[PDB]
Curated annotation (Swiss-Prot):
It is found in: Host cytoplasm. It comes from Enterobacteria phage T4. The gene is E. Changing D20 to E/Q: Loss of 99% of enzymatic activity. Its main location: host cell. The lineage of its organism: Viruses, Duplodnaviria, Heunggongvirae, Uroviricota, Caudoviricetes. This is Endolysin. Gene3D superfamilies: 1.10.530.40. Optimum pH is 7.3. Induction: Expressed late in the viral replication. It catalyses: Hydrolysis of (1->4)-beta-linkages between N-acetylmuramic acid and N-acetyl-D-glucosamine residues in a peptidoglycan and between N-acetyl-D-glucosamine residues in chitodextrins.
Length: 162
């Protein structure tokens, strides 16, 4: 298992524009297009992202291209953030993936707000971190996914995903 597989599992693949859990326009493997309620606006963002007139539909290759970009940007985002980098640096390979997952989903800013959790992860206080991460809107709104990521942080294994 690896980060790509993990997120493919968590986000699924949709080749037509759809609304995510928050009701926002998205496509492919969890690629958010816009927070705007306008479908046209979404269609617009899509064409710009893909480079062609899509009419709201893309191919598997186009979706994976977006995915590659999105994973790369998240890693790079972590590495550039003062609050995140040190945490990431301190962790093992599996747990790093967990951190990437969260950032992909919520943005670096969002993740940087889990100060307490971050500190706990940095101290390798697994169980405490897991409990703290659960006290969040994130967990309450998307419990299944949140549980998998949390288990990953708690155990340092891919069990949640097998
Ligand atoms: Cl979920």
């Amino acid at each position: 298992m690896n980060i790509f597989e993990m997120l493919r599992i968590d986000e699924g693949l949709r080749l037509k524009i759809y609304k995510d859990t928050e009701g926002y326009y998205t496509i492919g493997i969890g690629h958010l297009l816009t927070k705007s309620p306008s479908l046209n606006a979404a269609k617009s963002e899509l064409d710009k992202a893909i480079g062609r007139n899509t009419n709201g539909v893309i191919t598997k290759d186009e979706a994976e291209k977006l995915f590659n970009q999105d994973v790369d940007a998240a890693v790079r985002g972590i590495l550039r953030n003062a609050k995140l980098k040190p945490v990431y640096d301190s962790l093992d390979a599996v747990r790093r993936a967990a951190l990437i997952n969260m950032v992909f989903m919520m943005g670096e800013t969002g993740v940087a707000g889990f100060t307490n959790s971050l500190r706990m992860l940095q101290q390798k206080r697994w169980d405490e971190a897991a409990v703290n991460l659960a006290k969040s809107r994130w967990y309450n709104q998307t419990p299944n996914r949140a549980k998998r990521v949390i288990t990953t942080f708690r155990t340092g294994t891919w069990d949640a995903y097998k």
